[PDB]
């Protein structure tokens, strides 16, 4: 649950750079 | 509860996108 | 419950029996230093009929080698933390899956764990 939230935070950070 | 936290994650993602857009 | 005995004992190997619900009763003999003694008997009187005879000796062979790498002064699950990702994948696959017990594809990726844990050992 918490590790999936940290992977989602890395996904939204790369999506903000896209 | 949990769905309100997931909807707040999408709102925080749009706020992080505008911060990278101004930067 | 039967295959929930299996893949954790392949991935971590922390013994969790109370009345030997699996055909491999883990630690019924007192702990001794390893002289290649068989502590994990397979017990013909409780074999599942979806597990054939060459697979019941197979899961003993992975379960005997996973305990030999705990006392090798290493607590590392074999060769990567990818053995711990595998258990999570399997538990979500079970969650997504309707009611079917896999036995032809279940026996395939335990080869990929058996050959994995033997070369690292």
């Amino acid at each position: 649950a918490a590790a999936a939230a940290a992977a989602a935070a890395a996904a939204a950070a790369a999506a903000a750079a896209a | 509860a949990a769905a309100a936290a997931a909807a707040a994650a999408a709102a925080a993602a749009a706020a992080a996108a505008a911060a990278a857009a101004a930067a | 419950p039967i295959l929930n005995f299996l893949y954790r004992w392949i991935y971590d190997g922390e013994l969790e029996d109370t009345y030997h619900e699996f055909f491999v009763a883990s630690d019924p003999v007192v702990k001794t230093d390893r002289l290649w003694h068989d502590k994990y008997s397979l017990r013909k009187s409780m074999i599942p009929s979806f597990m054939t005879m060459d697979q019941s000796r197979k899961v003993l062979l992975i379960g005997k080698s996973i305990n030999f790498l705990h006392q090798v002064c290493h607590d590392q699950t074999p060769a990567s933390k990818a053995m711990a990702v595998g258990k999570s994948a399997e538990s979500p696959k079970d969650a997504a899956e309707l009611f079917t017990d896999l036995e032809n594809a279940f026996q395939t990726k335990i080869d990929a764990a058996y050959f994995d844990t033997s070369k690292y050992l």
Partner: protein, 371 residues
């Protein structure tokens, strides 16, 4: 997946960095070496083996023969470069690269025939389903934010000065300078004998490369730091070792980063690090030069120093015009900053139509790397 089910291989300038994506730190790093015992017989201390590669070869060096696949930052031989790729995939990680897409790096100035050689290796022997060729320069800039700016590659090998404008690099500005971190460690050896401390094995010479990044520090204004050293200030340090050799530093504290800007200490007439930075920007388009000064990024193993951000800022202002806003973006880690950029590129929202797969390699050969 590719957030975690993709491999980020950062083939550096002397170290291979493998590991799954999604992390901010690589899994297994070690110096890229191979070793061949030319004949057999008895093997003592380690296993009977016809080839020690990787970590079993670093324990036996006067027992083995040494070979570097990466010299001057460019691959010189492709047999031992694949042997380390065999070592990282199957021994230090032990996962099959047949279901997981593999993200590997390259030099900014390597030829296309070399770039076609590495596509032929990954598809045939390792059988990867998809891959992508990426420069090390764009990964460190993507970890620093947006994809515009110039990066200061100074690793163990050859210094690269690559200006990148929004993901696309400039063709005729990739300047090649022979300044290396291996030249500075050799420079530290030829002024340690003047102190009186020498070597007897290669193992005592190995820790000088560790002391180059650990004990030596960058002082802002090197020029008064030698002037305060001329007035005998407190700047001489003596590190202690388990054996009898005592390696000290005198005025060589500040001089090994001073050899970056002053190559006369290295014994050559070549340009300084700030000069090849300035010579690269002076042949760009004049409107995008302002975007390059404000996004200067440091990366590599030679640049591993505390207090190097303000030193690079004060050194570039004497050559650049005084109306430009210049900012040196110094990350906390910079040896691994190429690897974190390869993992955040791996966790991109859209990377699925940029894959170089097995299907297009069967239909157009290794020329699909042209993209």
């Amino acid at each position: 997946e590719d957030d975690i089910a993709a491999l980020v291989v950062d083939n550096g300038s002397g170290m291979c960095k493998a590991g799954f994506a999604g992390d901010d730190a690589p899994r297994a790093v070690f110096p890229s070496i191979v070793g061949r015992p030319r004949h057999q017989g008895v093997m003592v201390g380690m296993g009977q083996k016809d080839s020690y590669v990787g970590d079993e070869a670093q324990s036996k060096r006067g027992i083995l023969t040494l070979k570097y696949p990466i010299e001057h930052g460019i691959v010189t031989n492709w047999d031992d470069m694949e042997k380390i790729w065999h070592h990282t995939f199957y021994n230090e990680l032990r996962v099959a690269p047949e279901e997981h897409p593999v993200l590997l790096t390259e030099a900014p100035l390597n030829p296309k025939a070399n770039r076609e050689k590495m596509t032929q290796i990954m598809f045939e022997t390792f059988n990867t389903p998809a891959m992508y060729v990426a420069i090390q320069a764009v990964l460190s800039l993507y970890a620093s934010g947006r994809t515009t700016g110039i990066v200061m590659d100074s690793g163990d090998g050859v210094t690269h000065t690559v200006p990148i404008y929004e993901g696309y690099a400039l063709p005729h500005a990739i300047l090649r300078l022979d300044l290396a971190g291996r030249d500075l460690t050799d420079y530290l050896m030829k002024i340690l004998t003047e102190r009186g401390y020498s070597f007897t094995t290669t193992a005592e010479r190995e820790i000088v490369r560790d002391i180059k990044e650990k004990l030596c520090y960058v002082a802002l204004d090197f020029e008064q730091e030698m002037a305060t050293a001329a007035s005998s200030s407190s700047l001489e340090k003596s590190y202690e070792l388990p054996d009898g050799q005592v390696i000290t530093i005198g005025n060589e504290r500040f001089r090994c980063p001073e050899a970056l800007f002053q190559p006369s200490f290295l014994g050559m007439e070549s340009c300084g690090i700030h000069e090849t930075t300035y010579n690269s920007i002076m042949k760009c388009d004049v409107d995008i030069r302002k975007d390059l000064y404000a996004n200067t990024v440091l990366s590599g193993g030679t640049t591993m120093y505390p207090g190097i951000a303000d030193r690079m800022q004060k050194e570039i202002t004497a050559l650049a015009p005084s109306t430009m806003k210049i900012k040196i973006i110094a990350p906390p880690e910079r040896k691994y900053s190429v690897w974190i950029g390869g993992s955040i590129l791996a966790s991109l929202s859209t990377f699925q139509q940029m894959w170089i797969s097995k299907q297009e390699y069967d239909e157009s050969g290794p020329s699909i790397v042209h993209r």
